Structure 1
Amino acid sequence: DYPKTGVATSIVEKIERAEFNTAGRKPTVLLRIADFIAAMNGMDAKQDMQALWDAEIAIMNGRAQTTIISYITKYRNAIREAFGDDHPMLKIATGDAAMYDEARRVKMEKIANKHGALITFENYRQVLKICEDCLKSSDPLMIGIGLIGMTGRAPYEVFTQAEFSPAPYGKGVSKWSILFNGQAKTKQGEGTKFGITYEIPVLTRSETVLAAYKRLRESGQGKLWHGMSIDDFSSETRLLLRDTVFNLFEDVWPKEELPKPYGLRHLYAEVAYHNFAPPHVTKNSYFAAILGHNNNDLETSLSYMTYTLPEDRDNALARL
């Protein structure tokens, strides 16, 4: 209760921008958050805080649990922005503890189901070739896609904040590996890849990737993308990227699902493990190494194992 007044400038600016729009939805949630932070101003009693949060929770009732959790993240971030990390509301404005447990349960359950039913990525070579061809395109979006397919970085990392640099092999450059900076979703942890330049494998010669990236950065849309926030990047590119991926790998992607930009990261993991993995490491370890995870974290890699390579599928049936 040290600060009793505050303003979440993010939401407010997002509303002022949306005051004059040609079309689209009405920012109802942003409005509820704004009115929330507004009502929070001047409060010193915690019972009324609890009542406010009880009503606000009572609002988003007939919705999805994931949606509710995400919205709670929104509210909490708004509170942190407006007042600070010392406000009692942060201990009040949180989700029911039995909700997060159900979430975790469902998550690990899904992963477990995916691990018992791997998808055979039969035409993966064609996809890799498609990305490699996108590496030589003049459309920055395409170059971005191909970069996702080849270096395996996330769309946010690739389009907004990647720094690929030549990796030395003793003396000269490495043909099948580059350097990378910086990782996303790290939240600035002690043992995360925050501000860490580490070596990653690539699925085509390093000169080609470096060239395509150098072209990507110096473009107009590339400059428009650099340093962008996640919401900005979303509203700017998300649907276009989605439909371009939709149209690209239309008839070469596994029939069990639809082409999504993040599948290229999974395929990157599987293939680079299939080609470059040393004999004294496990799959989880190599995955954690090349994907850049928290220190001593091998469970996050479990979410990246959903595909199975045709050759493995073949020689596994060789035991007949």
Structure 2
Amino acid sequence: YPKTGVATSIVEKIERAEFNTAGRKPTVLLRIADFIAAMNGMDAKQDMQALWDAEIAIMNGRAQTTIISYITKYRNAIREAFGDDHPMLKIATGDAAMYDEARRVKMEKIANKHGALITFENYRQVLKICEDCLKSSDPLMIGIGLIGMTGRRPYEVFTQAEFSPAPYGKGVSKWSILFNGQAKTKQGEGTKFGITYEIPVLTRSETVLAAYKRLRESGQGKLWHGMSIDDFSSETRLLLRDTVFNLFEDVWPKEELPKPYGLRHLYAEVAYHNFAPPHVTKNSYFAAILGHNNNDLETSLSYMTYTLPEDRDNALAR
């Protein structure tokens, strides 16, 4: 295995922002930087262990989810500089108890959500707002529209989605689409990495495709295309967040605030309610239209968030 190397992406990130008008110092990226530097020319595992221990010591006090995320960042640095075969990857990681506790916390929140679905009283309005967004001249708007109407993740809509007409018999589907470019997935059997699959849309397919072409040809859109998640996050996140909040403030269910993933959750719910064939289950349907891996029905549990007020009505019929 190699003893020298460099996590380019980190250094570059740090070199940009050498000249910065404002903003906080890249302290963490700096720590990562010096860590990877200190690793240059280390052959002894106790040495590596000591280094990492110092890093973990610094992290203490920070939140558990924060630590798990930071550990990912270090591990990805190590991988970039030194490769997959480097003994530091066996050393630089979270305690197993930490990850286990994350799992418990998350399961508990989900179990809690499933026992108290949120009735999305005004979802019809929300969906129309999205539809109209599809016709806006502001590419951010169109993108929001498409998150709502196709359920693709922001990073997907804005950065990497390919949308196609889906053939329905010997014609073209008006309520589904072809989609390619799933995020959060690496190459693999039963994985939608690089797979084009059919997904339902909550308005006419002609409309969605056309709005997408408008998206793909705009000024902002050519810049967005092929961005890394850090680039995209930096450039849009807070603006997207503010726009979504403003656009939906008055209609969004009282129990929570309007956030962009809200649109994806609602999309699953509505798509199921309108399109699910009878031999498939809700967990299955979601996992299918959300692009989850083969045999994964557990991610689908995260998305069961609201109850459409129609279901709430007719369940209250009994």
Task: Give the 3-state SS of the residue equivalent to 1:18 in structure 2.
Answer: coil
Q: Distance in 2 between matches of 1:14 and 1:288?
A: 35
Please state if 1:3 is matched with 2:39. Answer: no
Q: Distance in 2 between matches of 1:177 and 1:56?
A: 49
Q: Distance in 2 between matches of 1:217 and 1:147?
A: 12
Aligned to 1:164: 163
Equivalent positions of 1:1-320 (< 5 A) are: 2-319=1-318
Shift, 1:189, TM fit: 2.8
Q: Deviations over 1:176-211 (max 9, x none)?
A: 000001111012232110010000000000000011
Task: Give the 3-state SS of the residue equivalent to 1:262 in structure 2.
Answer: helix
Q: Distance in 1 between matches of 2:164 and 2:98?
A: 43
Task: Give the 3-state SS of the residue equivalent to 1:180 in structure 2.
Answer: strand
Q: Which runs of 5+ in 1 are unaligned?
A: none
Task: Give the 3-state SS of the residue equivalent to 2:3 in structure 1.
Answer: coil
Q: Distance in 1 between matches of 2:92 and 2:56?
A: 9
Q: Distance in 2 between matches of 1:291 and 1:170?
A: 23
Q: Deviations over 1:93-148 (max 9, x none)?
A: 01001000000000111100000000000000000000000011110000000000
Could you tell me the percent identity over the aligned residues? Answer: 100
Q: Deviations over 1:206-246 (max 9, x none)?
A: 00001100100000100000000000000000000000001
Q: Deviations over 1:50-86 (max 9, x none)?
A: 0001111100101100000000000000000001111
Q: Which runs of 5+ in 2 are unaligned?
A: none
Q: TM-score, normalised by structure 1?
A: 0.99
Q: Deviations over 1:239-294 (max 9, x none)?
A: 00000001001100001010000011010000010001101111001101111111
Task: Give the 3-state SS of the residue equivalent to 1:164 in structure 2.
Answer: strand
Task: Give the 3-state SS of the residue equivalent to 1:176 in structure 2.
Answer: strand
Task: Give the 3-state SS of the residue equivalent to 2:152 in structure 1.
Answer: coil
Shift, 1:9, TM fit: 0.6
Q: Distance in 1 between matches of 2:137 and 2:267?
A: 23
Q: Distance in 2 between matches of 1:197 and 1:187?
A: 15
Task: Give the 3-state SS of the residue equivalent to 1:174 in structure 2.
Answer: strand
Q: Distance in 2 between matches of 1:80 and 1:234?
A: 22
Shift, 1:171, TM fit: 1.0
Q: Deviations over 1:155-190 (max 9, x none)?
A: 000000011100111011101000001111012232
Q: Distance in 2 between matches of 1:62 and 1:34?
A: 21
Task: Give the 3-state SS of the residue equivalent to 2:199 in structure 1.
Answer: strand
Q: Distance in 1 between matches of 2:262 and 2:297?
A: 20
Q: Distance in 1 between matches of 2:11 and 2:271?
A: 45
Q: Deviations over 1:3-27 (max 9, x none)?
A: 1111111111011101110000000
Q: Distance in 1 between matches of 2:102 and 2:146?
A: 33
Q: Distance in 1 between matches of 2:186 and 2:304?
A: 24
Q: Distance in 2 between matches of 1:294 and 1:79?
A: 27
Q: Distance in 1 between matches of 2:47 and 2:128?
A: 60
RMSD of aligned C-alpha atoms?
0.6
Q: Distance in 2 between matches of 1:245 and 1:283?
A: 27
Q: Distance in 2 between matches of 1:187 and 1:258?
A: 32
Q: Distance in 2 between matches of 1:83 and 1:195?
A: 27
Shift, 1:42, TM fit: 0.5
Q: Distance in 1 between matches of 2:44 and 2:151?
A: 50
Q: Distance in 1 between matches of 2:202 and 2:170?
A: 21
Task: Give the 3-state SS of the residue equivalent to 2:193 in structure 1.
Answer: coil
Which has the larger displacement, 63-72 or 181-190? 181-190
